Amino acid sequence: GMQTLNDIYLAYLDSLNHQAFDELGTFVDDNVEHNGRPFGLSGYRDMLVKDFADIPDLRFEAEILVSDATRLAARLFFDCTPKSIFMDLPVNGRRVQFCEHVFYDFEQAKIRRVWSVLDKVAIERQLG
Template sequence: MSVDGLRERYQAYLDCLNRQAWTELGRYVDEAVEHNGRPLGLAGYQAMLESDHAAIPDLHFAARLLVVEAPWLAAQLDFDCTPRGELFGVAVNGRRVRFSEHVFYRFENGRIREVRSVIDTAAIAAQLMAG
């Protein structure tokens, strides 16, 4: 897949997530997807995303930075949201927070096969302590 093709495919994947169009997820994510070394499979990956949306009702995936070197795509995703309860082990309890996720995706046959994600939890904790 070309660089432009991967970029377009990824933007369509983010749109799928933002619309919570779970029946379409298999178009973008491989049946044997792994997340941070854990073999979740498509059903487990979908369950993780549904759980994220349940905990963060206003969750919206927005890519600020994309770098593509096939078969890899790296993204910085920026979030501005109001999670319920805890978020990544930090008690947020409905307060608005802003943070970034740095994520690497490996595509195989046009679908995401591997996800490596790091979330800036320190930024979340710092915001909560400041205000």
């Protein structure tokens, strides 16, 4: 049936998994803000391009999705292999599992504001 924020979001994650960033503006506002950085669609694209450069096998998968008319919260689970430094940790090609908890404010079916927290402690424990 009729699409919901959940559908839009899972389509966004799909494009991310195929690294289809020419399509990014379908899902992300021109003036998107991420963790208070007002860096826009192109800053957001650069951020994702860098994430994949740093973690070639990165893949996005939501464990939990909660949403209403304007907002979506996702628990995303990662099982991946950062090449080098990641969150100032010398991961250095080891496979690690960690989650990200992220809130999205949508405006006109596109991500407008993002607040994200990654589980650095989970990574520390795996290296420690």
